[PDB]
């Protein structure tokens, strides 16, 4: 019995749209007293400045100690330099949670913000696109326990599909990130009398929802055993470990250079590209090792090699 | 450099379906004690009457002081007079939150109500938070969250969607998607829905670019109405309220206009007028964006 080398390939669109500056507007909220929305200012609790007249700030509550609570979203227009890259984390802006003590009952329970922008094709055709974001808000009753007193925001994983040069793209909310970290969260917790700023991360790719590029296969399909022996995957790992063979991790998420592998005992696998397109070179290959066992109990090891191919929207 | 007037148009289906009386049934809930559902009665906590045998009331909890908490939905069949108008706020009924103090742990966490009718079933979902009661009465309020669910159905070969908008205090204009109700209190709200063509509900809309026909550029001002004498400054990228809807116009001339008004509020020959005002030299010019808001029938769509 002998395990043979397997080969696969996955395409990742690596490309960019030309886009305008983005404009954020708080459009709707439920409940709350003294709710205001506005374009950010350098007033103490004004949220800071942005290049537009959209109302990027929202506030609520009668203050019990100083300022009103609320949210603010400062766009990333400068650094985005007029471009959205595909299959690439995009910092749309920085979302700040302003949590202050307000008299109880005075806060919203939910709210929604529009982010609008135009998209140019190669012929100069502009396509207006609006992404809607939704937030559930829990201004918690304040007690002597400061962790329990934190206020909690929940961001929905909303998206928008739009057309460009005759094909569909989807922009999709991923979540919130502490700058300089890699963890995305979908809920934020903020202490009273504090602010909390997070990058708001989105991605855009082809099709009607956003999906990480992926490929699937079966590594046992080409392996060799007597007509009267069944084969089973008993080991898997990132990289080339053929000398040693491998044990365990069957059905675990296995991190490679560009993405993750799951390989099941019956040889079926899915590989998913999680890396930013910018991190993926030309001639990119992802290598895994697996070990198979046959009915006799004999083991054999081989490689699964998956070409990560950078392609264009036009060639997709 | 010269700004040139711009024209656009947007169609709004203005029409109606013939429909039956609607029938509401609480079909499912999660958690809770002493949970009952029933057709409303004039018992004290019975919810009031409706013209059908659907179970429009739900209750839960062991009462600590008087009554059980729950929800009730009294349909608006009488005033709807057998009709759903398109792109028009519809009061499907009145939703009442009965919040009473019940022994802790006794309340549901969620529930679903069906609303059926002939032209179809709309499913509504509710998350429920019966909050632990303390000396702080605002913290002690119980909270309801309604989902923005919908149903698509066919009529004369085309798709329509009925969509939940949310809750409204009667005689007000604000829609909310969560309700907060004090203990030993009831809270009644209109439940607002809309129906229109297609597979989801979407407000009628149109898009364009006002700089496309201008002569030389950056938009530096926008406003509702005709302000050509003065020219305009600011509001680029803000939501600008007109008579029938809202405009957003960006610095590169791209705009979207969205009809929010009830169709009933939109006359024939309806036109929405905006003004906008700069070239590389720093010279300014002002012109108008005129949008027809056309009432059309389902057939003419």
């Amino acid at each position: 019995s002998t395990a043979l080398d397997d080969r696969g390939e996955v395409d990742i669109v690596a490309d960019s749209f030309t886009v305008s500056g983005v404009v954020a507007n708080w459009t709707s909220w439920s409940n709350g007293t003294n709710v205001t929305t506005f374009d950010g200012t350098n007033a103490p609790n004004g949220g800071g400045l942005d290049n537009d007249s959209g109302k990027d700030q929202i506030r609520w509550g009668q203050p019990a100690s100083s300022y009103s609570s609320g949210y603010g979203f400062i766009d990333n227009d400068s650094a985005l330099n007029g471009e959205f890259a595909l299959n690439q984390d995009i910092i749309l802006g920085t979302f700040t949670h302003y949590n202050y003590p307000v008299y109880s009952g005075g806060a919203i329970t939910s709210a929604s913000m529009d982010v609008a922008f135009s998209v140019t094709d190669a012929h100069g055709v502009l396509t207006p696109v609006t992404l809607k974001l939704n937030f559930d808000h829990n201004e918690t009753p304040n007690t002597n326990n400061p962790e329990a007193s934190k206020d909690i925001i929940k961001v929905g994983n909303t998206n928008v599909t739009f057309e460009n040069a005759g094909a569909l793209y989807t922009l999709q909310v991923i979540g919130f990130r502490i700058p300089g970290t890699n963890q995305i969260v979908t809920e934020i917790r903020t202490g009273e009398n504090a602010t909390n700023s997070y990058e708001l991360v989105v991605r855009v790719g082809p099709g009607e929802g956003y999906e990480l590029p992926s490929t699937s296969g079966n590594v046992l399909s080409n392996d060799v055993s007597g007509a009267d022996v069944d084969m089973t995957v008993v080991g898997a790992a990132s990289g080339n470990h053929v000398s040693s063979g491998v044990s365990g991790s069957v059905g675990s998420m296995i991190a490679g250079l560009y993405g993750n592998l799951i390989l099941l005992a019956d040889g079926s696998y899915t590989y998913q590209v999680t890396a930013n397109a910018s991190s993926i070179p030309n001639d990119a290959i992802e290598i895994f090792t697996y070990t198979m066992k046959d009915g006799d109990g004999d083991t054999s090891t081989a490689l699964l090699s998956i070409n990560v191919n950078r392609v264009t929207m036009a060639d997709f | 450099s010269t700004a040139l007037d711009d024209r656009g148009e947007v169609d709004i289906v203005a029409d109606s379906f013939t429909v039956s009386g609607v029938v509401a049934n609480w079909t499912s809930w999660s958690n809770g004690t002493n949970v009952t559902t029933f057709d409303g009665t004039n018992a004290p906590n019975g919810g009031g009457l409706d013209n059908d045998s659907g179970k429009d009331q739900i209750r839960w909890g062991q009462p600590a002081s008087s009554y059980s908490s729950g929800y009730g939905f009294i349909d608006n069949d009488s005033a709807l007079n057998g009709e759903f108008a398109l792109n028009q706020d519809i009061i499907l009924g009145t939703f009442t939150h009965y919040n009473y103090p019940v022994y802790s742990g006794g309340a549901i966490t969620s529930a679903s109500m069906d609303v059926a009718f002939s032209v179809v079933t709309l499913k509504l979902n509710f998350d429920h938070n019966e909050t632990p009661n303390t000396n702080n009465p605002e913290a002690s309020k119980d909270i309801i969250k309604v989902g923005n669910t919908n149903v698509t159905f066919e009529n004369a070969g085309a798709l329509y969607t009925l969509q939940v908008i949310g809750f409204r205090i009667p005689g007000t204009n604000q829609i909310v998607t969560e309700i907060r109700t004090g203990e030993n209190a009831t809270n009644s709200y209109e439940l607002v829905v809309r129906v229109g063509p297609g597979e989801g509900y979407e407000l009628p809309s149109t898009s364009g670019n006002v700089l496309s026909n201008d002569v030389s550029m950056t938009v530096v001002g926008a406003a509702s109405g005709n302000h050509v004498s003065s020219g305009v400054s600011g509001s680029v990228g803000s939501m600008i309220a007109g008579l029938y809807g809202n405009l957003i116009l960006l610095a590169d001339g791209s705009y979207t206009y969205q009809v929010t008004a009830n169709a009933s509020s939109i006359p024939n020959d309806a036109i929405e007028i905006f003004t906008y005002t700069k070239d590389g030299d720093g010279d300014t010019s002002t012109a108008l964006l005129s949008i027809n808001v056309n009432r059309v029938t389902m057939a003419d769509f």
Partner: peptide, 5 residues
């Protein structure tokens, strides 16, 4: 009594 959230 000056409850805050």
């Amino acid at each position: 009594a000056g409850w805050t959230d």
